[model samples]
Target chain A: MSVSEIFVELQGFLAAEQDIREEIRKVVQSLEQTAREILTLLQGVHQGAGFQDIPKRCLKAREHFGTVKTHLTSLKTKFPAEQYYRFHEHWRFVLQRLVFLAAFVVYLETETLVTREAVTEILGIEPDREKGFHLDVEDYLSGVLILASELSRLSVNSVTAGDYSRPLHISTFINELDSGFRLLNLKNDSLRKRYDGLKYDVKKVEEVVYDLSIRGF
Target chain B: MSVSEIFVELQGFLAAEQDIREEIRKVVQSLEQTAREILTLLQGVHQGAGFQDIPKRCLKAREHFGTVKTHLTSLKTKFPAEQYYRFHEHWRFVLQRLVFLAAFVVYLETETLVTREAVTEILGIEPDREKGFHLDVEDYLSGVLILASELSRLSVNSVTAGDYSRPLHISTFINELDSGFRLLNLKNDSLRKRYDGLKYDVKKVEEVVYDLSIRGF
Candidate 1:
């Protein structure tokens, strides 16, 4: 009847909202732990004799996607479908990391860019906001940017492993990605920073390619 | 024909997007400058002999709103209608401050809460998201919270000028505002912090009211 009772209603909403947020945090933490394990699996790619084990490492990492999908499905139900933006910050960082790991695994096995659709399918969420729990475009792009940096490292390591032609392949892939990213009107600070650092990744791969061409490999 | 040319389309999109963002920044800057000038006019309320000139100050502040309205109207034309959230951040802080100033002026003249409808009209914007440019609900609430703090200071200074009755009035207004704020589910760190600090404002006015009551004034 009065504006005074509005506070009581609000208290109930916040109490409920807080519970939802807490549950989301728990799930994201679990998700993050799993991502770290998968990353450890993928990190083997840059180690001794690891180049030959890429398929094995990717297969092991793929097993972890089932658990990641479960976490994401549970996370989607923790809040109202219409409130994605409201609860997004709670899960955004972890989601981006998951996207990176998924992209990394795909790249390891396929040597191609992982499409946004494939990442969402791997994570068990929708690719559209209307369907709820969709992967944000910026987060997807951030994952790819990170993957570019990692691949630059791989370009250098490929040479160490006596693979003379791998750097040239990496140089072409990153160059194409660099060109694609230059077309985006990135406004988010996090995305823009990653994009800016992408040029360094491009340069690293280019230097490796230069080393190979000079020696007539 | 090649995935390579995809970069050209993206480049065009980004170039257009950058121009839009730059224009938005320019408009928001103008809006901010106008808000500062208006705030300077309103700051007189807390100064010597400024209390009695409330209505006159409100009149002067109203004139600046015309300029604010023009700037906002031009800003709306600079971006796609559905991309409000994208560009909202560019103007949001300045908008919150403008909301506070508008609320301050209304409270100065009327001694009542300014409804969201009134604020939208004052700023010459829509009150709904579907209408393109609209006054965000949280920004309006944020403004009220700021007004409560300003009133609390006024409560102390009123007594300095031998106006004991004004503190009693301010105490009631802020207490009512505090009660209304307690009813909402605030998730933003900025709004939540403002709401948290509202209690301090409530305490200050309460102390003034208590002093007057004990003195039997």
Candidate 2:
């Protein structure tokens, strides 16, 4: 390959990155709108909505992630790896929000932690070589952790809203996830630091559980 | 639980965190040592070691990760999320190194992306989220991408060593991974930037393949 060829690929990559970022932003826009709806669903659960309705309502968010997947699928065909990796950061919140929504449903329906595979599938992707985009496991994990944080708050708020028993489940589940995190050998990276927020989530959940129990939940 | 109990649990969590961090650091020393060994084994692959020998020689490294898992298991018996999250970042370089090592064997063995299950299983966790600490797929995937970068270097150097056929495999593997990543909705974060490094890797590999093709290899 000539120097000119290298330059050509480089230029093509930069240009593709620009185009993809815009398309990603648009996808994220739809994702953000869906995220707000999911947050509303979660907020409904936190207040007094039929907890059983969580996933049904969140179908919109899930489908929105499917749209996001379509956006990414097109990007992959044109941009592929270098360009995709370069600009995919623009899509983090959307993925995170997607995971948050998914985990919320799992907690409400199954009373369990959402698996990364579930999150990826919910986002309409897979482990790679799927027909479309794949979810970053790290991002999906982040979404799980993010859900934990919100649940911690919900644990407190739910109690105030006269939902007494939910905190017990939330506390135990958060602690379980906490225990799991302890076993992961993480690098000193952003995921590690952001996950640190989980500690506060665990503590807050504990505090909520403790408060409720003292007052007799 | 009394206020005294709360204080006691908090104290316990704190002491556990302190002890766990120290223990984690020591375990990390061993983990780092294993990482170094794996790096050497991979370097051997990059230089002249039989690609088939990767799993066998890297066995020590794999076992070392097991040892690290034991240390982390002990940590879990003694730790929580944030403290562990912080401490795991301490374990970060080690985990990412392991993923980089594992993905090496996978691509060399199967020519596909390492599933989160394979990585977590190798590291002794469940897929993304199970009963143990979840392996960050993003980090694991980053490790896979890092392999692409190193393989790019291999693609160029192998020709010097009279290996014409290897770059063909390397190029296809990389392009496939590139396509997989393109399907991701990435963030414009450090991970994205690190992914940007992947662009260079793809280009370098492309160059090698192009050079090989043009030079009539």
Candidate 3:
């Protein structure tokens, strides 16, 4: 048969698959929104004058992340066994990496804002007198970026394996995340350059905040 | 945020995109049906006995191919500009290859089933009395397989780029084609041994049919 005829007959099938594609888009959009909210909270914590009640914020963020995980699980249930297996494999990997990064971020934030005594009390770690507890947040953030990039690649693969339709929301979310990470990297570079005098500038923090807010993550 | 929270949010968005996914599925089903009908028609022509009116069947097949092409074009239009561009670039390459193979198939089928004079008359070619018609059916079939493989890859990439669900039908089709090609290759090996007079019973025509059916020009 000619390609045109084949397409004519297959139109119905493609349309049916389109429903699934729309669902994926919706999932991606929700994820993006949640990410944006988390970014806002993180920025607020970073810029606050003193050690604010960040533990509560961290707990709330954790709850929100838990909600995201539940949605991903439900999404996995929507597919058939074969597809579910393939998608779940990749999804789980992404989730695990993200969770690990979140934990690292939490650790970094706790160390930076909270006193050593408070950290010891909350995390059951012995307080060290000499060390300042300022671990390599930059390296941790880079690691998160690496994981996110891999997750994005896997998401693309998963989408390609199932149906043919434009997943606008998911693609947009991915692009946003990509740009957000790049911005974060650039800010980190600027911070390293300015950290020589052991000083934090309000303007620099505002710039980072603006970039994060505009990126929606 | 926690992974669970992300999952919950993603579910909400996925619900919204479900509608679009259904539309795409319908289009794919239509394309499959059209392909099957054309295949049936081609099979009829192949199995017909005596000197059949092959040119008419060829024309009908070409018409069907044209229809398939039109359907693909319509489906392609559904994508956003970014996705549409990527899909178009990949699909154009695939379609060009398929068209060439389809043309070659028509040439071979015409030359093989009818007299050289009749083949020349149908194809509007000058008859070569000494050499007869050297229409390479094997090459044509191999081309078809190659084009099919390319189409499968393009479909996969489209899903990947769009972040839509994978094209399950194309992947399955590719797997089936790959297995069939392997089997045909084995059969060809046996046929080659037989042709060398190594006590073989399989007819050369059967081998030719096997080659042309599974592979393409």
Candidate 4:
């Protein structure tokens, strides 16, 4: 192309890119707000049982989270590679941290009111009679925190480069997956050995979450 | 507030925040494009004989950078902290990083060819003839890089918290200043011995850059 033509195309491409970038920014801002609200609500519930509406609050929080997820998915679809690499890594970290926080709260609540299958119902992890509280919520939270930090760094690098392509996105995803697996591997041996069902359930949930995020809900 | 009222205001605030967020995103993207162009132009002109056309290209690049700075300043002026802070701190980091990048690039380019007298002419910094180089471009670049990394972390923390505020902005600025001083402190003895005029000149140039950024040209 001629220099003038190249300049014109560059301007056009930049304009379009700017629009997509704005859309992604909006989605991210919205998601952050929703996440903050969820944290506040979760904290409130965790602090006092006076709000004995766990299911309702959880559902409401989930609904807001669902909207965030939908907006994020739209952002991903709009500029799949750009959005994925530029911001989705950070989004994933945020989501993973949120999930970990939710799990921690659920575990704490379960500890207070011990029912035969209560923990399973709350955390979606099936219980084994012989397991004896095999859920390591701290370990899970720590693992997610580490994953989030790594993802944060990757997102910064991707943003700086201005080429948020599929390869970078996928590599970040793979790193998170690998790190998660390593964390799982290091789980207490007794818990890992005794509660195969719980382990299977955890893996299943991870797969579901990953697929939902990557392939869309 | 009632749920409907809260939701309505929340939506309004989010929309405003998104508008500012999008504007900032475009500004940063444009700044990056401009920076790359300046760097390319600089590389093209770095080696030639009399450095005649190099000055012209530098002037052109500065004009383009001027446009970017205009947009960024306007965005900052119109930014609503009440609305924007609700979303994330990454926004603050992005803003500060842009400012730092602009300042650093201007300093780097100006350092390449300008004599102490030329620097004084532009930055109103009275330089000493005894100092070999008024400001060490390498050291300044390193300082900017360090500040950029810290800003990236601050951005992540803000994103995690869903609040980006003026204090965060100010904090990043302070951090950059601290880094700049540390760079000055680490200068070699030869550089330091003649540093009196050079140090003052650098500070004056930095102040001018800061004013150009925060207070408009």
Candidate 5:
């Protein structure tokens, strides 16, 4: 057949992919809205609330993960396995936010950092790139940077709530996280930009710790 | 050291990288402006011009590649070897257009496709990713797709200038390019989107060739 005939056939082939992307975009938007609801639930930690008040918020946010998983699972079924990076941008920011929320809830409930495995399990995705739908380490790192900022904010409020030891605890956790981030040779992108803010968070929490120690609390 | 103290040091380290990127951005902007100048010169081909009229435009356009090379060479010196992908997005689009312009000039002058090596030589850069500041294959492919569209336009005007044979040659080249693209599984991105336009160009040139054949020209 002529090249025109071949291309005519190819055009029809490509049209379906565009329609699929639009479907993916709608699903991702729904997923993003669900994440915002979870974020609102988590934001209760900043309202002069102590650790004792955290689990209730955590419990409410944990329930939202069911919707996140359903949205993501539906998104996964829309595209082929090898084209993840192709459609990655559509959901990348939302996925990072979800990771941060998941990590935040785990930290509040258990007083420990959330592992990537726990995060993927919570979101009902895989942790391996080869396994179709998985959490990228870079996205996970982006979430960790966000979590540091949130923790820094929490340290000041914990002090206001008369929990003097939490600032020191936050400082210790942020210090180690800071050290770990130093090991990564990050590129100049959104993740790296967010990583820059991490240092300020570290400094802020350290100042909180300094105040607690000076008063000998 | 304390996390605050460590971050103070880290902040200085990251500052230099940011400065380097700004320098790269300025140089890339200069390169893009030069490409625009070359494009203005190339647009003469669409003014009912035949292959005989292409050489002068090609000669004028060829001189601008020197500016492209100078800007690119300075950009290369500003970054480290391992961080090419880190900075790849900044120059990626402009580099693709350069490839298209360079290929257009070569096709106009010698009626042949420009090799990647030839284009890199003209731009004073490398072709291997390992060598740093290389012409990425994807960028080159993006350029080739653009060249197909330009050639298809040229085919219509070639006949308007009473040169029927050129449309046939353009159709052959575009047909082969279409077949080559079909061999690869393109991800859903800018390149694939541009690839979709290639078929319309293919069909346009094919119609021109069909007109010529039916007229027995």
Candidate 6:
């Protein structure tokens, strides 16, 4: 008799989880909305699309993250690790997308690698420790994979714009990135699976370089 | 003088990765196409659909997996673990989908809760290979997620098909599934996001049960 009654208790738990989901989504939705805006801002930065205000643009993105950080910082007090993991776990994709947007801003501004540490710093988060909370390597690497794909497209676009040497430069960088990814002893992860797709991006960039070779460049 | 010359050498590696993907695709493609066939058959097994011919229908689908096994077994030599990981990364989705399809066949044949090992047996794959390839835990769990969602849908359809009492039975099983999934320490993964979606599945089944109770059944 009580076995059936337990179903009603479980329904209350579901209701609470629904509340948690709503709270997290409210913050993450805004994170992604700002991420989308920053993406639009940075898209023009690639090789003469007229996006020169790098520091100003990055600062604008940082201003959005300040709001995101405030929301998350407050929620940390409301719901610690277990609940936070449960809630933020749902937001990894949004975070990954934002990582790409932020990393892209840095890459264009300084032509440098946006390491995981750099991403965590830009987002104003702590390094992964044993207990508290941390951003995932998979999310950061997902951003890197997106960067590779973007560069692969950039390689071809540069060639079309008659910038032959830029394709060579991007190809070399992507190849090195692929090599670094290959060095990892990947277990079952979204990062491991995603790295495989990046090799295809590496190949696509090489083909652009190859096409230039045939034209006697 | 040999700078660009060495660049072509790196291109060889890119081409090789593409070859490995081609080889893996040739096998994974077979898995998806037949898995699709089984999904169509299983989806028809309830409500307004005449899916009652379950055993031999699944038997036909089972035969398709035999070919998938043969291809993978033969290619065990063609792609080593190091290379296999890179190419099979993208193929994990197909593998996960097939896992669900195979588990569905088992569930229909007995209305039993199919375990991960049993699903692996049906597919003839290893569970987490060390120096070789293996089915990921995340993907296996995804199959079980589909099990929960399907059972949720079945709980609704069972009512419409005039078996009002079956709703409680399905809801109980889904709740147990939710409990099990919650036990796992899910990290940033497609599995983590997917497991979240499973709550909605559990809720759907609960709603069906609540409707029955409200009717004083």
For every candidate in turn, the CA RMSD to the true structure comes to 24.9, 27.6, 29.2, 25.3, 27.2, 25.3
Q: After superposition, how far is residue A149 of candidate 3 from its true place, in Å?
A: 54
Name the 10 consecutive residues with the lowest summed lDDT in model 6 chain B.
B208-217
**Against the true structure, whose TM-score is highest?**
1
**Lowest lDDT 10-residue stretch of candidate 1 chain B:** B43-52
lDDT of 6 by residue, A1-217 (tens): 4976999999998998788777766766666666655665554333332234557776776677776676556545545576556666767887788678777767666667787877877776667754454778777778888888777766644543345677788888899888888887878577878888997888888876786677567
Q: Evaluate residue B146 in candidate 3 and report its C-alpha lDDT on the 0 to 100 scale.
A: 43
Number of the top DockQ candidate: 4
Q: Residue A84 CA error for candidate 4 (Å)?
A: 2.5
Per-prediction interface RMSD in Å: 27.9, 22.4, 23.7, 17.6, 29.4, 25.5
lDDT tens digits, residue span B73-128, model 5 = 88888789779999898898889989999999998887788998899998899867
User: Model 4's DockQ?
Assistant: 0.02
- When 2 and 4 are scored with TM-score, the better candidate is 2
Q: What is the DockQ of each candidate?
A: 0.01, 0.01, 0.01, 0.02, 0.01, 0.01
Q: Which stretches of candidate 3 lie over 4 Å from their true place?
A: A1-217, B1-9, B16-20, B80-105, B108-143, B146-217
Candidate 6 total steric clashes: 0
- Residue A90 in model 1: lDDT: 86
Give interface RMSD (Å), model 5. 29.4
Sliding window of 10 residues with minimal summed lDDT for model 3 chain B: B198-207
Candidate 5 residue A9 Cα shift, in angstroms, is: 2.1
**Which of 4 and 6 is ahead in TM-score?**
6
Candidate 5: list runs displaced more than 4 Å: B1-217
Q: What is the TM-score of chain A in candidate 3?
A: 0.41
Point out where model 2 deviates above 4 Å.
Answer: A1-28, A31-217, B1-13, B49-75, B81-86
Residue-level lDDT of model 3, residues B43-109, one tens digit each, is 3332232214356666787677776666655654454534333333333333333433354345435
Mind giving the per-residue lDDT tens digits that candidate 1 earns over B1-217? 5676898888899999999999999998889889978877776554342356777888999999999999999998899988998878899888888888898898878888889889899999987744878887888888888888778666654543345677888888998998897787786757898789899879877877876675465
Q: How would you class the docking of model 5?
A: incorrect
Evaluate all candidate structures by whole-model CA lDDT and list the values in order.
0.81, 0.68, 0.41, 0.44, 0.82, 0.70
